[PDB]
Amino acid sequence: EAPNQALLRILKETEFKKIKVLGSGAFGTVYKGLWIPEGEKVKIPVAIKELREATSPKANKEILDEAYVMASVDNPHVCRLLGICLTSTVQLIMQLMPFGSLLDYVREHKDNIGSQYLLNWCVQIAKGMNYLEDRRLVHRDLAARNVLVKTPQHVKITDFGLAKLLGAAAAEYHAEGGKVPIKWMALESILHRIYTHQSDVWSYGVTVWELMTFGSKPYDGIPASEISSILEKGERLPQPPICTIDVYMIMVKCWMIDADSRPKFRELIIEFSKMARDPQRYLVIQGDEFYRALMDEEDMDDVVDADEYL
Ligand SMILES: CCC(=O)Nc1cccc(-c2c(-c3ccc(N4CCN(C)CC4)cc3)[nH]c3ncnc(OC(C)C)c23)c1
């Protein structure tokens, strides 16, 4: 396999500003802030994840593993790592996705979300996953909650917490016993802890169903324990009301038992691109037809998105 010559930038703490707290937890804390590289007339909006405890070796190995993965894949439609900071508590510096997770977005703006946006998001998530397949990366946790909103027009995959790089000449990843989201997993992942690009496709299909339902929960009210049996008996998620047969047939194909009978992300890109050219022909939706405050700072002249920084 090819040498992985990704670059990992180490950042000084003095060259970023934590402005606000987006979220906290036992994992750590995620700040909103600005990164000003010393000597460059540039200010980069960032999300900064800092560990709560500096003394957990397991937490430090996992955070660096996440950094390794993200640095090894740099692209649009993938949330970008800018660097890490090796302070008392390790910090990941990431590109700020101001509008949160797509799952929250469709739930808060269902009434104002049209077919054009829904299909473009589907195209974008496909381009992202097709890039990850090129990098021999298997995401293992694709879900509407793990796609974030840069702008309403532009979404990006993230939470590479469970993402695993495939070894050279290997097409499957055999995982150990661990907490994993059953409702988004392919049947072979559930029964045999097997993950591939094609199991990623299964999850893509569930992700699209979340979007097409405006944020509903798959198999709501059903224990994850009987999911395996439901899938084996041939059940699948139902057709969402706005979805023409054309769209739903794509989703269904994603949920075949034979992983090689599921589409490839390249084909999902093409097919959703076609539908994005005439969106109201494929989704029937009722009624279809400078932000310095965001950064809580006044001087925004030299602001540059990470997607333009190198
Ligand atoms: C627990 C998993 C998770 O992604 N947590 C989390 C918590 C807080 C913010 C973000 C986040 C956000 C983010 C999340 C929520 C919001 N909203 C919430 C809804 N509200 C109405 C407006 C503000 C805005 C931005 N943007 C990010 N960009 C890059 N990395 C991130 O997190 C990475 C470093 C883990 C994040 C993510």
Numbering used by the authors: 697 to 985, 997 to 1017
Paper text:
Ligand-induced EGFR receptor tyrosine kinase activation promotes downstream signaling which triggers cell proliferation and survival. Sensitizing mutations such as L858R or delE746_A750 in the EGFR kinase domain render the receptor constitutively activated, independent of an extracellular ligand-binding event. Acquired resistance to these targeted drugs is caused by a secondary mutation in EGFR (T790M) at the gatekeeper position that occurs in 60% of the patients, inducing steric hindrance to the first generation inhibitors and thereby preventing inhibitor binding. Herein, we present covalent inhibitors of the drug resistant gatekeeper mutant EGFR-L858R/T790M based on the pyrrolopyrimidine scaffold.
To our delight, we were able to solve two co-crystal structures of potent inhibitors in complex with EGFR-T790M/C797S. This is the first report of X-ray crystal structures with covalent inhibitors reversibly binding to C797S drug resistant EGFR. Outstanding potency was observed with compounds 19g and 19h, possessing the iso-propyl and iso-butyl ethers in the 4-position, showing EC50 values of 38 and 51 nM, respectively. O-Substituted inhibitors 19d, g and h were the most potent among this series of compounds and showed high activities of around 9 nM in the biochemical assay. The iso-propoxy- and iso-butoxy moieties form large interaction surfaces with the gatekeeper methionines, rather than steric interfering with the side chains as observed with pyrrolopyrimidin-4-ones. However, due to the C797S mutation, the acrylamide warhead adopts a position distant from the side chain and does not form any protein contact which might account for its high flexibility and only partial resolution covering this moiety. Interestingly, we observed an influence of the spatial size of the residue in 4-position on the orientation of the warhead and its linker. The sterically more demanding iso-butyl residue pushes the linker towards the mutated Ser797 side chain, which indicates that increasing the size of this substituent facilitates a ligand conformation that might more effectively target Cys797 in a non-C797S-mutant EGFR kinase. Accordingly, a high potency against EGFR-L858R/T790M/C797S was found especially for the O4-substituted compounds, which were found to take advantage of favorable interactions with the methionine gatekeeper based on analysis of two obtained X-ray co-crystal structures in complex with C797S-mutated EGFR.
